[PDB]
Design an enzyme around this catalytic site. Structure first.
Site, mmCIF file in Angstrom:
data_model
loop_
_atom_site.group_PDB
_atom_site.id
_atom_site.type_symbol
_atom_site.label_atom_id
_atom_site.label_comp_id
_atom_site.label_asym_id
_atom_site.label_seq_id
_atom_site.Cartn_x
_atom_site.Cartn_y
_atom_site.Cartn_z
ATOM 1 N N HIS A 1 -8.028 1.136 -6.498
ATOM 2 C CA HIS A 1 -8.353 0.194 -5.391
ATOM 3 C C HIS A 1 -8.574 -1.204 -5.962
ATOM 4 C CE1 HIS A 1 -9.231 4.155 -3.736
ATOM 5 N NE2 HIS A 1 -9.047 3.596 -2.527
ATOM 6 N N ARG B 1 -13.330 -8.914 0.511
ATOM 7 C CA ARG B 1 -11.872 -8.585 0.502
ATOM 8 C C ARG B 1 -11.089 -9.826 0.940
ATOM 9 N NH1 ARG B 1 -10.161 -3.237 0.654
ATOM 10 N NH2 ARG B 1 -8.123 -4.256 0.545
ATOM 11 N N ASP C 1 -20.174 6.726 -3.891
ATOM 12 C CA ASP C 1 -19.329 7.264 -2.794
ATOM 13 C C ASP C 1 -20.024 8.480 -2.179
ATOM 14 O OD1 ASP C 1 -18.736 9.209 -4.820
ATOM 15 O OD2 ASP C 1 -16.563 9.219 -4.334
ATOM 16 N N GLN D 1 -10.232 -3.960 -3.671
ATOM 17 C CA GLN D 1 -11.651 -3.691 -3.368
ATOM 18 C C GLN D 1 -12.461 -3.918 -4.647
ATOM 19 O OE1 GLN D 1 -13.031 -3.011 -0.170
ATOM 20 N NE2 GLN D 1 -14.689 -3.810 -1.439
ATOM 21 N N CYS E 1 -19.121 2.552 -1.473
ATOM 22 C CA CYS E 1 -17.728 2.607 -0.967
ATOM 23 C C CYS E 1 -17.836 2.435 0.549
ATOM 24 C CB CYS E 1 -17.015 3.873 -1.428
ATOM 25 S SG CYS E 1 -16.798 3.912 -3.236
ATOM 26 N N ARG F 1 0.894 -1.182 0.000
ATOM 27 C CA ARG F 1 0.000 0.000 0.000
ATOM 28 C C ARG F 1 0.927 1.226 0.000
ATOM 29 N NH1 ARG F 1 -2.289 4.625 -0.739
ATOM 30 N NH2 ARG F 1 -3.948 5.178 0.719
#
Lengths: 294, 294, 294
Positions: free
Chosen positions: C130, C277, C218, C133, C249, C103
């Site tokens: 992402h 995930r 989002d 995700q 999100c 990350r």
């Protein structure tokens, strides 16, 4: 179906007795080098809103010995704020792991976390109650002297630390507790009243010790003037049952030391109190996840 | 019975040679994808009074590959204060885990921890001695050139970093060491005298390099004026034995880089030095816990 | 030979479809209590230049379930500075572990890390993309409604968060994307142009929703004046395909909550987005290390 451990009474008297006995058997297995791994593929989530290294090491070591893995969430990792931050942490973490231990201070926080968890919650300790240490203390007594049912336990010191846990345990494990508290440092009357069936307040530490099977204290060696007569010595142990064992709250803050005399006294089981956090918690995790075993 | 690794000499010459050979065999096993898990149910406690990511990753990876688990205690987790805080950390942590590695700076601290441990202690590194890196360095030499017994090793730079570890190793692994140190940056005479049997001080780096089988340096590429002639180059390696290998202390602080020329030179074994912390430490943990194996 | 996951297109359309299908099968296996441990002896290195607890817990849980171990490197553990500090972290960490997730925020940083890694690199998330995700989102759609190929997806909100990931995914998974963005909060035109084949900009959220199979947003419940008509409600879902599913999100910052109406609506798959995930990343690690399996 879904069972939690939020307070000692979440297990019946018989489950508590079976657990302590099971913890003793798991301790002999580990020391004999037996491989017992019922949790291959399983994960413990450890949520610490306030840090406890003793809790963390013992849980992490336990789940590992059982073939599982422990995830260490430190305070400022995940959101424990009251409301949605708490309830959403619960549902999402429990969709991924198989069991959660939580160290918080809200007694309402651990209950809310539990309500939204798809998996068993262990309340390791709160600011008022130490249920994991209390299980380790009851294992340690059982291993040295057998059943504590109808025995006499003497708490020496104030109403802080593990006092309330011992008062709560009196009823559940079936023992009589005397609290030998210095004048002006007695537990909350409202608490005393709650456990008035099994628990009595006794100023004179010499009288409280009379016929005791377990003496336990949070009085740290040298306010100090006021606690000085509540210092547990070999002398005080001499006034108890000849089978008495001695326990001491383990050090929590800098400056808290237990005398060499009390650690080395043959009636002292302090080192087992610390080790048995490992075995008592393994027994508890095994109990809460037993329908995943075998 | 209970054996520790606090200093290199805690293993005999033959145990050290068997260990380096065993580390090479464990490295081939892991790379060949062999599953070797003698430590299922076993736990390593890693105590860091000062942080070392290279130590932490290598130990954690090693114990994991062996089927065990590693508990990472960061500085301000557990009490390492001299006296009771140290000795009580030792007895309690060792009642729960099977082996402890410690990174401290007190040479008296690691000895006291060991005295009260029921389990083997590994001193990974102190502020003066780097025994785990030194084992990895001796593995790396062995893998590329076989036995270092009766070979010539040339240390180029000051008396800091791994200098004392190499001086100590000379006697134990049976090699001759030359320290090529710049004027005003020589090791402590008292040290030189301690290892005067196997170790000599030589100003001229060109002469020190003559017939060397291993050149090792803590001199970082560009005080700098004074170290400039002690920069190890391909040129300096040309004056050594044609079988010479080159090692370099691995970067510890910001700005410490090894030239591309030295990393890419065919005589350079720097990358094996770093990887072999994994394999050398696995060999060590296996040795200290061998009576728990099989 | 050596394959990385730095961007979604590092897997072909068919590998992506096989991965999502494999993630669904791994999810059923774990829930059914099947033990699947292809990574005994294997280690995941997790490098966090910026912290992501959701990434960390999911990866750590995944590698553990597979019988491996995960090493958690927090920001200020290892040197991620551009140049040698980055490239030397890569070569040394990859000589010890079997797979690395990173990350970071540099899109050039993850590429450089990959170039010097002997092991597969997973880019979990950057500041712009992402990909983990997004795999979990595509698994979640697949599990509730099957294949997303030739379906209509409607993004509601600005060009931040997972917008670019959805635009990128449109082409690779074969869906049509509408971005319903408030006036003055549209994505970068240059991006729109890059994905102009599969992606269209549509101001009217009511029209964008028409015939949608997946609505994703989002937009956080109550600038706020400007986003108010872009709040996804049960009302908006009523204008979509009757088979529509809703994603949101997941919360990234304090104050970001999803309404109870949207979480509890029967078309909402938000809780699967978070759980998956775990399963999507297990499918990915299995794919990148498949030549180490069996």
């Amino acid at each position: 179906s879904l069972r939690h451990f939020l307070t000692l009474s979440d297990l019946t008297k018989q489950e508590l007795e079976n657990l302590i006995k099971r913890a003793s058997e798991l301790r002999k297995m580990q020391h004999a080098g037996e491989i017992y791994q019922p949790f291959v593929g399983r994960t413990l989530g450890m949520i610490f809103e306030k840090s406890s290294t003793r809790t963390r090491i013992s849980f992490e070591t336990g789940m590992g010995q059982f073939g599982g893995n422990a995830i260490f969430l430190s305070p400022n990792d995940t959101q424990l704020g009251r409301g949605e931050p708490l309830e959403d942490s619960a549902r999402v973490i429990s969709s991924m792991v198989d069991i959660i231990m939580i160290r918080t201070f809200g007694h309402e926080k651990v209950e809310t976390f539990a309500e939204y968890s798809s998996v068993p919650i262990i309340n390791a300790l709160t600011d008022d109650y130490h249920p994991c240490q209390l299980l380790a203390d009851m294992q340690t007594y059982y291993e040295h002297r057998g059943s504590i049912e109808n025995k006499i336990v003497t708490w020496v010191g104030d109403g802080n630390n593990m006092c309330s846990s011992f008062m709560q345990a009196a009823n559940q494990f079936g023992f009589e507790l005397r609290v030998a508290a210095p004048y002006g440092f007695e537990p909350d009357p409202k608490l005393m009243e709650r456990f008035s069936h099994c628990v009595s307040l006794v100023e004179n530490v010499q009288d409280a010790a009379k016929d005791a099977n377990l003496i336990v204290t949070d009085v740290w060696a040298s306010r100090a003037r006021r606690f000085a007569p509540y210092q547990v010595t070999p002398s005080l142990l001499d006034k108890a049952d000849p089978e008495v064992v001695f326990m001491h709250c383990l050090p929590a803050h800098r400056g808290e030391e237990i005398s060499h005399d009390m650690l080395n006294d043959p009636r002292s089981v302090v080192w087992d109190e610390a080790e048995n956090r490992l075995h008592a918690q393994k027994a508890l995790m095994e109990f809460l996840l037993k329908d995943k075993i075998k």
